[PDB]
Design a protein around this nucleic acid. Structure first.
Length: 141
RNA sequence: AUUAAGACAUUCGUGAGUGAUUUAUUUCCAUGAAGUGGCGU
Protein backbone atom coordinates (compact mmCIF):
# COMPACT_ATOMS: atom_id res chain seq x y z
CA UNK A 1 0.00 0.00 0.00
CA UNK A 2 0.95 3.64 -0.55
CA UNK A 3 -0.42 6.25 1.86
CA UNK A 4 -0.20 10.05 1.79
CA UNK A 5 -0.90 12.57 4.51
CA UNK A 6 0.37 9.83 6.75
CA UNK A 7 -2.33 7.96 8.63
CA UNK A 8 -0.55 5.29 10.67
CA UNK A 9 -2.28 2.11 9.52
CA UNK A 10 -2.07 0.05 12.71
CA UNK A 11 -2.13 -3.70 13.24
CA UNK A 12 -5.52 -4.99 14.37
CA UNK A 13 -8.28 -7.52 13.61
CA UNK A 14 -9.88 -6.97 10.21
CA UNK A 15 -12.69 -8.22 7.99
CA UNK A 16 -12.08 -9.27 4.38
CA UNK A 17 -15.60 -10.24 3.35
CA UNK A 18 -17.60 -13.44 3.59
CA UNK A 19 -19.52 -14.75 6.61
CA UNK A 20 -17.43 -12.77 9.12
CA UNK A 21 -13.95 -13.60 7.82
CA UNK A 22 -11.23 -12.60 10.31
CA UNK A 23 -7.61 -11.88 9.39
CA UNK A 24 -4.59 -10.72 11.39
CA UNK A 25 -3.20 -7.52 9.87
CA UNK A 26 0.54 -6.99 10.31
CA UNK A 27 1.77 -3.64 8.99
CA UNK A 28 5.42 -3.51 7.95
CA UNK A 29 7.07 -0.28 6.84
CA UNK A 30 9.32 -0.21 3.78
CA UNK A 31 11.56 2.48 2.32
CA UNK A 32 9.61 5.46 0.98
CA UNK A 33 11.88 5.75 -2.08
CA UNK A 34 10.32 2.66 -3.66
CA UNK A 35 7.30 2.16 -5.89
CA UNK A 36 5.50 -1.11 -5.20
CA UNK A 37 4.88 -1.94 -8.87
CA UNK A 38 8.44 -2.89 -9.73
CA UNK A 39 8.70 -4.71 -6.41
CA UNK A 40 5.86 -6.96 -7.57
CA UNK A 41 7.45 -7.26 -11.02
CA UNK A 42 10.81 -8.12 -9.44
CA UNK A 43 8.99 -10.89 -7.58
CA UNK A 44 7.51 -12.06 -10.90
CA UNK A 45 10.72 -11.67 -12.96
CA UNK A 46 11.46 -15.40 -12.76
CA UNK A 47 8.50 -16.14 -15.09
CA UNK A 48 9.31 -13.86 -18.03
CA UNK A 49 9.80 -14.90 -21.65
CA UNK A 50 10.44 -12.53 -24.54
CA UNK A 51 7.61 -13.91 -26.70
CA UNK A 52 4.93 -13.82 -23.98
CA UNK A 53 2.92 -11.49 -21.76
CA UNK A 54 2.15 -13.35 -18.53
CA UNK A 55 -1.05 -12.03 -16.95
CA UNK A 56 -0.29 -11.71 -13.23
CA UNK A 57 -3.54 -10.05 -12.08
CA UNK A 58 -7.01 -10.14 -13.66
CA UNK A 59 -6.98 -8.02 -16.81
CA UNK A 60 -9.96 -6.16 -18.28
CA UNK A 61 -10.23 -4.95 -21.88
CA UNK A 62 -13.35 -3.22 -23.18
CA UNK A 63 -12.86 -4.99 -26.53
CA UNK A 64 -11.16 -8.38 -26.56
CA UNK A 65 -11.43 -8.37 -30.36
CA UNK A 66 -8.71 -5.72 -30.54
CA UNK A 67 -6.49 -7.73 -28.19
CA UNK A 68 -7.02 -10.85 -30.30
CA UNK A 69 -6.12 -8.86 -33.42
CA UNK A 70 -2.81 -7.93 -31.72
CA UNK A 71 -1.58 -11.44 -30.90
CA UNK A 72 -0.94 -14.89 -32.35
CA UNK A 73 -2.60 -16.68 -29.41
CA UNK A 74 -4.66 -16.03 -26.27
CA UNK A 75 -3.90 -18.90 -23.89
CA UNK A 76 -6.26 -17.31 -21.41
CA UNK A 77 -9.20 -17.91 -19.08
CA UNK A 78 -12.21 -15.90 -17.92
CA UNK A 79 -12.93 -14.60 -14.42
CA UNK A 80 -16.00 -12.73 -13.20
CA UNK A 81 -16.04 -9.42 -11.33
CA UNK A 82 -18.92 -7.85 -9.41
CA UNK A 83 -18.31 -5.12 -6.84
CA UNK A 84 -20.42 -3.78 -3.98
CA UNK A 85 -21.17 -0.13 -4.75
CA UNK A 86 -21.42 2.09 -1.67
CA UNK A 87 -20.86 5.82 -1.23
CA UNK A 88 -19.96 7.77 1.89
CA UNK A 89 -23.61 8.65 2.60
CA UNK A 90 -24.74 5.05 2.12
CA UNK A 91 -27.01 2.85 4.22
CA UNK A 92 -24.30 0.26 5.04
CA UNK A 93 -27.04 -1.59 6.95
CA UNK A 94 -29.41 -2.57 4.14
CA UNK A 95 -29.34 -4.50 0.89
CA UNK A 96 -25.96 -3.71 -0.72
CA UNK A 97 -26.17 -2.21 -4.20
CA UNK A 98 -23.80 -4.48 -6.10
CA UNK A 99 -22.05 -3.41 -9.28
CA UNK A 100 -24.19 -2.48 -12.28
CA UNK A 101 -22.12 -4.76 -14.52
CA UNK A 102 -20.50 -8.15 -14.14
CA UNK A 103 -17.11 -7.73 -15.79
CA UNK A 104 -15.01 -10.46 -17.39
CA UNK A 105 -11.30 -10.24 -16.59
CA UNK A 106 -8.55 -12.58 -17.70
CA UNK A 107 -7.12 -15.09 -15.26
CA UNK A 108 -3.74 -14.87 -13.50
CA UNK A 109 -1.60 -17.28 -15.49
CA UNK A 110 -3.07 -16.33 -18.87
CA UNK A 111 -0.54 -15.61 -21.60
CA UNK A 112 -0.89 -13.38 -24.67
CA UNK A 113 1.37 -14.43 -27.55
CA UNK A 114 1.90 -11.28 -29.59
CA UNK A 115 3.05 -11.20 -33.21
CA UNK A 116 6.33 -9.74 -34.44
CA UNK A 117 6.53 -6.33 -32.86
CA UNK A 118 3.27 -4.90 -31.55
CA UNK A 119 4.35 -5.68 -27.98
CA UNK A 120 4.42 -1.98 -27.15
CA UNK A 121 0.96 -1.68 -28.71
CA UNK A 122 -0.59 -4.36 -26.49
CA UNK A 123 1.21 -2.86 -23.49
CA UNK A 124 -0.34 0.52 -24.35
CA UNK A 125 -3.77 -1.08 -24.72
CA UNK A 126 -3.47 -2.82 -21.34
CA UNK A 127 -2.07 0.19 -19.46
CA UNK A 128 -4.66 2.72 -20.68
CA UNK A 129 -6.85 1.80 -17.67
CA UNK A 130 -5.12 3.68 -14.85
CA UNK A 131 -7.75 3.20 -12.13
CA UNK A 132 -7.52 -0.56 -12.68
CA UNK A 133 -3.71 -0.52 -12.64
CA UNK A 134 -3.61 1.53 -9.44
CA UNK A 135 -6.18 -0.74 -7.79
CA UNK A 136 -4.01 -3.78 -8.49
CA UNK A 137 -5.56 -5.00 -11.73
CA UNK A 138 -4.08 -5.41 -15.22
CA UNK A 139 -0.59 -6.25 -13.94
CA UNK A 140 1.66 -8.28 -16.25
CA UNK A 141 5.30 -9.20 -16.76
C1' A B 1 -18.04 -1.24 4.57
C1' U B 2 -15.49 -5.29 1.17
C1' U B 3 -20.56 -10.12 -4.93
C1' A B 4 -21.76 -8.10 2.11
C1' A B 5 -25.43 -9.18 6.79
C1' G B 6 -28.50 -12.67 9.08
C1' A B 7 -29.54 -18.85 10.09
C1' C B 8 -27.47 -24.82 16.20
C1' A B 9 -28.41 -30.29 10.47
C1' U B 10 -32.63 -29.41 13.47
C1' U B 11 -38.27 -31.49 14.84
C1' C B 12 -40.81 -35.89 15.49
C1' G B 13 -39.10 -41.44 16.65
C1' U B 14 -38.73 -47.25 23.06
C1' G B 15 -33.78 -51.76 19.85
C1' A B 16 -38.62 -53.03 19.43
C1' G B 17 -42.22 -57.28 17.86
C1' U B 18 -42.45 -63.03 17.48
C1' G B 19 -39.83 -67.23 20.48
C1' A B 20 -40.67 -72.91 27.17
C1' U B 21 -33.29 -74.34 27.62
C1' U B 22 -36.13 -77.77 25.13
C1' U B 23 -35.44 -82.73 22.83
C1' A B 24 -33.33 -88.05 23.48
C1' U B 25 -31.50 -91.14 27.79
C1' U B 26 -34.27 -97.37 32.82
C1' U B 27 -29.84 -95.57 38.81
C1' C B 28 -28.68 -99.64 36.17
C1' C B 29 -25.06 -103.99 35.73
C1' A B 30 -22.40 -108.42 38.81
C1' U B 31 -23.54 -110.82 43.33
C1' G B 32 -26.46 -117.83 46.93
C1' A B 33 -28.57 -115.16 53.63
C1' A B 34 -25.15 -118.33 53.40
C1' G B 35 -21.09 -121.82 56.29
C1' U B 36 -19.95 -125.23 59.98
C1' G B 37 -21.79 -128.80 63.64
C1' G B 38 -19.24 -130.09 68.60
C1' C B 39 -19.18 -133.34 72.92
C1' G B 40 -18.19 -139.51 76.37
C1' U B 41 -15.69 -146.46 70.81
Amino acid sequence: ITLSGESELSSDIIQLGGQRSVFRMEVESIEENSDIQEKYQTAAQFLTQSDRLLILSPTYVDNLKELSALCNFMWSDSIVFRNIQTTNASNFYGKPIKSSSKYHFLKPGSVLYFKQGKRKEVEKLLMDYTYLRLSGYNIYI
